[PDB]
């Protein structure tokens, strides 16, 4: 439990998780891609909407 050192009043510094990865990820690997992902059919990944 590290609550007395990480937590600060009025929000904290951003800590992120990924919502989706396309393929099964092989052991000991990570994705740091910050590219804008899209769920619908309409094109994105370079367009914000």
């Amino acid at each position, epitope marked *: 439990n590290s609550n*007395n*050192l990480d937590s*600060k*009043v*009025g929000g904290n*510094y951003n800590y992120l998780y990924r919502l989706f990865r396309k393929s099964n990820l092989k052991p000991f690997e990570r994705d740091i891609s910050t590219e804008i992902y899209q769920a619908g059919s309409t094109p994105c990944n370079g367009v914000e909407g």
Partner: antibody
Amino acid sequence: EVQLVESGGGLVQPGGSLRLSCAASGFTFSGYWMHWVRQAPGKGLVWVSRVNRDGSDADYADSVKGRFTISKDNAKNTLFLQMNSLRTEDTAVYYCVREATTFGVIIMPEWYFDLWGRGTLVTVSS
Amino acid sequence: EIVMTQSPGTLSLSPGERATLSCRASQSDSSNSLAWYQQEPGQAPRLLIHDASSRATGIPDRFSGSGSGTDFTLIISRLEPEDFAVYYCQLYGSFGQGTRLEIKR
């Protein structure tokens, strides 16, 4: 004995900059978490700022946000705080205070203050 | 965000007879991490208890109070002529308004 000497402060024009020092004698100014507290004249005290052991991360309240910057100088043994655009309501007395840590297998601060040094009066008026 | 109300505002009691002080938080439970601070108006604040259960060394054994979760109560076993001070309460992020302990006459 364990004591913190507060230096700086005084008269300052509104919109100006001010800068405070806090030298720590009697204990190790390396691992203990540091806090800065203000107290308005004839009013209650509110929390100002917090800094950890290394000094990368800092914690500021909304009123002091964007104007106050705290820095812990472990090697030089001093707690520092720089203000700019000091508003009129900031006229108060400033205390440099410590935050307790067990210093066990983890530092693990507790967010309670141990010793309060004598604070300095900062007055800003036209 | 978090607001502490110390009730009541003025506690006027005779020097001989005891006193108690109750502080009311606003929301949530902070693992019972709370502290009391006694402030003689000319002097600086000083801690009385830490973690709301244990009492810091040097503080007189009279000062002993405890609570859990919702409301935090701090009981003073007897009374001596030093309670001319404002008693504040320091939570995770904010300080309470405080209470003032007067002498009856």
